[PDB]
């Protein structure tokens, strides 16, 4: 599936004041149903629980996210407004 992130509502997030503002929004889907969403840094990495498994997720300069996700699950990124 190509999921249309242009029509996803923004995550409910908090830009923690003592760390830099993250440049990306991520969205996690299970069989095309949005489970959650949030923020992450571009050109970076995070460990996230995706369904039953921890996944090491890398982000590129354009907030494209790479990982080895479990069947039926995906985490997709995009740049935040202005970034």
């Amino acid at each position: 599936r190509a999921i249309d992130l242009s029509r996803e509502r923004d995550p409910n997030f908090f830009d923690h004041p003592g760390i830099p503002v993250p440049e990306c929004f991520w969205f996690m889907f299970k069989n095309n149903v949005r489970q959650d969403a949030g923020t992450c840094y571009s050109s970076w990495k995070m460990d996230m629980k995706v369904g039953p498994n921890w996944v090491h997720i890398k982000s590129d300069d354009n907030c494209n996210l790479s990982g080895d996700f479990p069947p039926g699950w995906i985490v997709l990124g995009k740049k935040r407004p202005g970034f």
């Binding site: 995550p11 003592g18 760390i19 969403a37 050109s43 970076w44």
Partner: protein
């Protein structure tokens, strides 16, 4: 240096999320704590020297079921 940890808290009844916020916020090394997520059931904490496994154990003992969802570095 700083870590970002996200925990999902079960909404079992009787202000679980408030209680979980309070317990997370009380942990040594915390800089900030926020209730986030599409269902407002995730706590995101940023700080130093926080042991995420111990924090889950403490939530499960004192507040209710909780799951660790993210651990990442915040030092970009």
């Amino acid at each position: 240096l700083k870590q970002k940890i996200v925990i999902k808290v079960a909404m079992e009844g009787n202000n679980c999320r408030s209680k979980a916020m309070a317990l997370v916020a009380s942990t040594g090394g915390v800089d900030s704590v926020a209730l986030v997520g599409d269902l407002r059931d995730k706590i995101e904490v940023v700080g130093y020297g926080i042991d995420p496994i111990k924090l889950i154990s403490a939530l499960r003992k004192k507040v209710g079921d909780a799951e660790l969802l993210q651990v990442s570095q915040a030092n970009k």
